[model samples]
Target: SRARVLTEAPKVTFKDVAGAEEAKEELKEIVEFLKNPSRFHEMGARIPKGVLLVGPPGVGKTHLARAVAGEARVPFITASGSDFVEMFVGVGAARVRDLFETAKRHAPCIVFIDEIDAVGRKNDEREQTLNQLLVEMDGFEKDTAIVVMAATNRPDILDPALLRPGRFDRQIAIDAPDVKGREQILRIHARGKPLAEDVDLALLAKRTPGFVGADLENLLNEAALLAAREGRRKITMKDLEEAAS
Candidate 1:
């Protein structure tokens, strides 16, 4: 089989997902609380059964979700919107049921659905698939301990039932990084790269006002590629400057 089931948490923690302090804290609250629901439940603290990650694509939404699972040390199952459907009508519903049942086997697991907007928009307007999803959310008991997380750039068209209390109860927004945030992201990506002394992250950050995590990563990649082309051992400020252009 091409797909392999992972038994361990991802190697990366929240620290590796830089420039998302606010989103990290919010996800931590949800995942940490779920680690011991009985303790939190004693005070009427109900962990969010569903977490919707909302942002533009390439802002590290999926990366942050993995960090959440890694931080919680739970089994992580990631599925894409396209994985939910088939050419037949009832097939999608069956996949949803089987998906939930499979996730249940490994209790206290995290399920991440990427680009869920398309899943619900398809499937005959998602009457059956989403209905089954809603049931799964409401049916999970205190001890069930399954957390559903999904990402979508377009939340406007998503089925309203997907966001109710028993479903994804919290929506986490991951916005583009500001200037200082951009600098932090740059440093995180620069760890192993050979950088010349003239490569100033602060100036780069100032120049790129509205860069996202992916954009900063791209900048560094371009710099590295330019350095390699010139047979330079280290990426210099000139390489970065040319890469930015």
Candidate 2:
């Protein structure tokens, strides 16, 4: 297929993610369905067809999307919004068709579109591409065993049509993590690293007021890198402090 999609089961699971506990709770329904698509379909129970994960950059929206499929142990098909935009008029729509067709072949899978707001905004020429995306979302059957997921930092720019009931109905907003969340993220990233007793993640979390998961992970990674640079066997508070600066 001309469309370049990531059609693989992501290695990231719920256990790998650090914070966003509530968001994980909200995604349980999708996970259950993917785990046993036929069981729910036979019972005539309806789960959400689409999930819209709204969060700022680096808050783990994409990470969370992968974890959903990981939890279910199903195939995950990933594509960026820009992948649908093309220089030719009909190319974008063709890619959309190809995307869903591929998803159907790999049922009980997830299709995640990152930065969805990039498709229609600031490009009047991309209206056809947007329409095709809406049509694709509506074309899927409830028993198809596929879930369409999207992520965007700018939710306001999207067309209202995409958020209709049968479309991206289940909305999950993930805000920046608080101190407790940051500390948890730090500990997750701190795994497998030689940390000196002087490195207090709790105090580090307290010091970082607005840090997100990515930021916290980076901080710990930088600290480890600094310690290694200094030929030290273990990461210390001094290394963390210098990395934060």
Candidate 3:
């Protein structure tokens, strides 16, 4: 009998992500390496084993991971750290093996694990789960060609072994966007929304100093709502300012 192959249909590529230009660049490099690992090796560049995205929550780390997989036009497997753990002792190990096996069957793919600290924590409570994750990550061969990307807000809680040379070798820190970056993010998300002439995204960005990607998105949504409440034809800067507070 033919082995059951799990295949996901191709989806639209994500062209632009708000803020985090550095993160996008790093992921692009990974995508390029995945496309042609030999080219990097010829230049004496080491093939990246994995990248860990660490920062405060809602900064679009997972979004960047999806964008990488989408831009690469490769199959992507999304799993949460909690998905590996179960009531039984060896259940997590079995799941980890299964995940790798699935990735092997779908080579040249990206595997994204969200909230990895849940399973990759340093404490003794989740020793078995951490051990299983480490084994699956490091024991897998380079030929599998599956790039593993994991995101977490707390990198301090992760095991040191996981951060060693081969496993999650690169750690990318994503923070809230600055003024210009925030404006770009606002513009990207506000696309297609009706805006009044008074609406100035530059000023809005300046006002929001520590806003994350999600906050910007909510800001736009709130602006629209305010406009509707006021029975205005379009969203105005006043409405946006009110939403920001």
Q: Model 2, residue 74: what's the lDDT?
A: 90
**Residue 101 in model 3: shift from native, Å?**
0.6
lDDT tens readout by residue for model 3, 9-85: 24534456766777777777888877776677678877787789988788888777777777877877877666655
Name the runs in model 2 displaced over 4 angstroms. Answer: 38-44, 225-233
CA RMSD (A), model 1 = 2.6
The 10 consecutive residues of candidate 1 with the worst lDDT sum are: 1-10
Candidate 2, residue 188: the lDDT equals 78
Residue pairs that clash (backbone atoms under 3 angstroms), model 2? none
Order candidates by TM-score, high to low.
Answer: 1, 2, 3
Misplaced by over 4 Å in model 1 are 1-8, 86-89, 122-125
For residues 1-245, write the lDDT of model 1, one tens digit per residue: 12222334666788777677888888887777657767776777766789998887788888888888878878788765565553355666677776767777876878877667756662363576678788888998777778888987766777777876789778999888878888888888898788988889899888888788889888899899999998888889899889888
Deviation from native of the Cα of residue 161 in model 3, angstroms: 1.7
Write candidate 2's Cα lDDT for 106-141 as tens digits.
Answer: 988999876677674636547877788778888777
- Which stretches of candidate 3 lie above 4 Å from their native place? 1-14, 40-43, 86-89, 123-125
Clashing pairs in 3: none
What lDDT does candidate 3 reach at residue 50?
Answer: 77
